[PDB]
Structures are given as structure tokens and as C-alpha cells.
């Protein structure tokens, strides 16, 4: 967002004072020569003097260090001072970066590196658990229940989320972990070169983390329209469920995709600056959290009715087994706590980073916890594994 601005302003300032240097007649006195060190151009001063020339305007923070200068002296031979290996030395410290902003940048760099390590180690063993759950699920007797098909095509969505977020993470690493040699290499870097792969992996990630919330919506709505009706469901409606889980995120991604392709073409599309009509990607997630949190409380307003009429044969399981399922059933309805008011807009400070840590941590171990709670502690798939172990312990 700012590096491209700095680059074009550098091109404009360099050409502008190329034109300005083109309009300087030579004096007859000992002046140090027609010089430029490729970012700080100046009028030419007599030798053994320093210059109170302003430090250049193309900087990003220039309008807050605007009343500063740069002081460089050409020595006794009409030539500037030298560095370690003859390098031009400048006293550009007065409009350099302020000494505490680099420290707070170091602090948020350590915060971002810590969060990155946390959510990648969440998503990676999440992937390693959901693939085991899928290879358990689609290889056994119960491989197509219309209950269990939605769990298989939910774990597919969680894999599509995790193995895309830790891929757009890798491309953001790779695009920003190289040495900036010359202007031509970084101009090819800034132009639309291999950043098209970054853009399509960004729309892959925005498809993953919207298909996953719409799939938690369908995993909710199945369980809601499974319990209201008296009989068993006649039609499985699996066309409708597969549609409302994997086609609605397409119709919510591609308006955002063409808006980010035409109206805000930032370098790689993970920069959600100017977040008017980024709201078109966070309205379906608000929907697919509110309208299954409503049915999450509507499922406990009957689960506590079913745990209260009979099954009083265990005392204090009325609380233990009406909370040992209420911890379990957030496969779907986490994070109403820090999102239903706290938006990405009007949230600053450590409240924002605390919300990011909460939702990032829980949504990075959510896939692990869903795969465990629904393919390794389900006693049906337990017994169906035990029978195959009986069949494999005879040979």
C-alpha cells in the first residue's frame, strides 16, 4: 500500500530534480560538482562547506518530518566525504525513522511472528487430523449416512481452509524475504509478475474461509431441520445442502473478487485497505454465525428439556452431561463473543489484538477439535474400528 507509493514518488522526484539539475548554469568559483546519490539531490555548493538542503519529499512519513533537512559537506577538493569504502555519507538522521517507532515495529513484529507460529502449528496438525478423519470416514461401513456425508464434506472444507491459509502465508513470506538489489529487479517485483499467483491464492483463501463458515451454517441447518419434524427426513436434500454450502460462497466471493480486481488493485489482495465493500465478504460470515448461534441456543432449549424429564438415574449428570455436550457442540458457533459488536472497524489497541488472538487460536485448533470430536470419540466409529482390528488381528 505504501511501497508502491514510495516507488512512484521516488521516480517522480528523481525525474523532477533531473529536470532541475538540467537548469543550473556553472559558476566560475570552486564548486563541488554536478552530483546526485540517487535519493538526495541538491544544488551545488562551494567546497569545504556543508549544505542546509531539505531532505526529500518522496518519503512516506515526509509530511510529519517536513520541517527537517539533510546536511552533507563536500570537502577541500570539491568532493564529498567518504564512508568505509568511499561511500557517500549523509547526516539524514533528523528526518529518519524515529527511534521508538522502530521499537514498536519490533514489538508488533514479534507479535506477528508469534501469532504466525501459533496458527500455522494449529492448522498443520489440524490438517493431519482432518485427513485421518476423512480416510477413516470414507473407507468404512458408515461411509454414506446423510448425517455423515455432511461431516465428510465439512472436513473437506476445513482442509480447504487450513491448507490455503498456510499457503497464502507462505506466498506472503516468499514475496517479502529477498534482498532489494537494484531498481529494475524491484520494479519487476512491483509490477504484476508472480503476484498473480499471490492474487489467486488470496481469492483461494477468501473462498476457504467463507466456504467454511457457510458450511458450519449448513451443518447447523441440517441439525435444526432434523429435530423439528416428527418423522425421519424423507428427502435428504443433499443437493440443497451441497448448494447452500459450496455455491453461496462462490456468489459471495466473486463480487468481492471483481471489486478487488477492478476498483482496488492493491499489490497482493490480502491488503484489505479501504474497507468499504470488504463488508461484502463479512456479511455472510455474520449471517452464518448469527443464524446458527440462534439454533445453537435453540438446541439447548430442547437438550435441557430432554435431560430433565427422565434420566434422573444419575445425580449431577444433569449438569455434567448438559455441559459436556455444550463444550462439544461448538463445532459451529464459536466467536460470537468478540465479533457481534467488535468489528475490524472501530477496534484498536490490545482489544483488537486480543480478538485476533482469540479467534485465530480457536479457529486454528477448531479443525483438530472437530475431527477428534466427530471421528475419534464417536463410539460408533470406535466400535467400527474395533471390528476391523478384530479382522486384522487374525492375520
Amino acid at each position: 500500500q505504501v511501497m508502491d507509493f514510495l516507488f512512484e514518488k521516488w521516480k517522480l522526484y528523481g525525474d523532477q530534480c533531473h529536470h532541475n539539475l538540467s537548469l543550473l548554469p556553472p559558476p566560475t568559483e570552486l564548486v563541488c560538482n554536478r552530483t546526485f546519490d540517487k535519493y538526495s539531490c541538491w544544488p551545488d555548493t562551494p567546497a569545504n562547506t556543508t549544505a542546509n538542503i531539505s531532505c526529500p519529499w518522496y518519503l512516506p512519513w515526509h509530511h510529519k518530518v517536513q520541517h527537517r533537512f539533510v546536511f552533507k559537506r563536500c570537502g577541500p577538493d570539491g568532493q564529498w566525504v567518504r564512508g568505509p569504502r568511499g561511500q557517500p555519507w549523509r547526516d539524514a538522521s533528523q528526518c529518519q525513522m524515529d527511534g521508538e517507532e522502530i521499537e514498536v515495529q519490533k514489538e508488533v513484529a514479534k507479535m506477528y511472528s508469534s501469532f504466525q507460529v501459533m496458527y500455522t502449528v494449529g492448522y498443520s496438525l489440524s490438517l493431519g487430523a482432518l485427513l485421518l478423519a476423512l480416510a477413516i470416514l470414507g473407507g468404512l461401513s458408515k461411509l454414506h449416512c446423510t448425517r455423515n456425508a455432511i461431516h465428510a464434506n465439512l472436513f473437506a472444507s476445513f482442509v480447504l481452509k487450513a491448507s490455503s491459509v498456510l499457503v497464502i502465508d507462505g506466498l506472503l513470506r516468499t514475496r517479502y524475504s529477498q534482498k532489494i538489489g537494484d531498481d529494475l529487479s524491484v520494479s519487476t517485483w512491483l509490477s504484476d509478475g508472480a503476484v498473480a499467483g499471490c492474487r489467486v491464492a488470496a481469492v483461494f483463501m477468501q473462498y476457504g474461509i467463507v466456504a467454511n463458515y457457510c458450511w458450519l451454517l449448513v451443518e447447523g441447518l441440517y441439525l435444526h431441520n432434523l429435530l423439528g419434524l416428527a418423522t425421519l427426513p424423507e428427502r435428504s436434500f443433499f443437493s440443497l445442502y451441497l448448494g447452500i454450502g459450496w455455491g453461496a460462497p462462490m456468489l459471495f466471493v466473486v463480487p468481492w473478487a471483481v471489486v478487488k480486481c477492478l476498483f482496488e488493485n492493491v499489490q497482493c489482495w490480502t491488503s484489505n485497505d479501504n474497507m468499504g465493500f470488504w463488508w461484502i465478504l463479512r456479511f455472510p460470515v455474520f449471517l452464518a454465525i448469527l443464524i446458527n448461534f440462534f439454533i445453537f441456543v435453540r438446541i439447548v432449549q430442547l437438550l435441557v428439556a430432554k435431560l430433565r424429564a427422565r434420566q434422573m438415574h444419575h445425580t449431577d449428570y444433569k449438569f455434567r452431561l448438559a455441559k459436556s455436550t455444550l463444550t462439544l457442540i461448538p463445532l459451529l458457533g464459536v466467536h460470537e463473543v468478540v465479533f457481534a459488536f467488535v468489528t475490524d472497524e472501530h477496534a484498536q489497541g490490545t482489544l483488537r489484538s486480543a480478538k485476533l488472538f482469540f479467534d485465530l487460536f480457536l479457529s486454528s485448533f477448531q479443525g483438530l477439535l472437530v475431527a477428534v470430536l466427530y471421528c475419534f470419540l464417536n463410539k460408533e466409529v470406535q466400535s467400527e474400528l474395533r471390528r476391523r482390528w478384530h479382522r486384522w488381528r487374525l492375520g
Binding site: 505504501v2 515495529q105 501469532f115 497482493c268 485465530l360
Partner: peptide, 29 residues
């Protein structure tokens, strides 16, 4: 929605890391 928000900040930071790195290249060489 945080994964669309955290990398919105991990991008809006990371270019500002590059911009200060870009000055720091032409600070020296």
C-alpha cells in the same frame, strides 16, 4: 472473521517493513 483481518494487518504491516527497508537500501547503497 479474523483470518481475513489478521493477514489484512500482516500485509499492511509487511509493506511498511519493506518501505523502511527500501529507504535503508538507498540509505547505504
Amino acid at each position: 472473521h479474523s483470518q481475513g483481518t489478521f493477514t489484512s494487518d500482516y500485509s499492511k504491516y509487511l509493506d511498511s517493513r519493506r518501505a523502511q527497508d527500501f529507504v535503508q537500501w538507498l540509505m547505504n547503497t
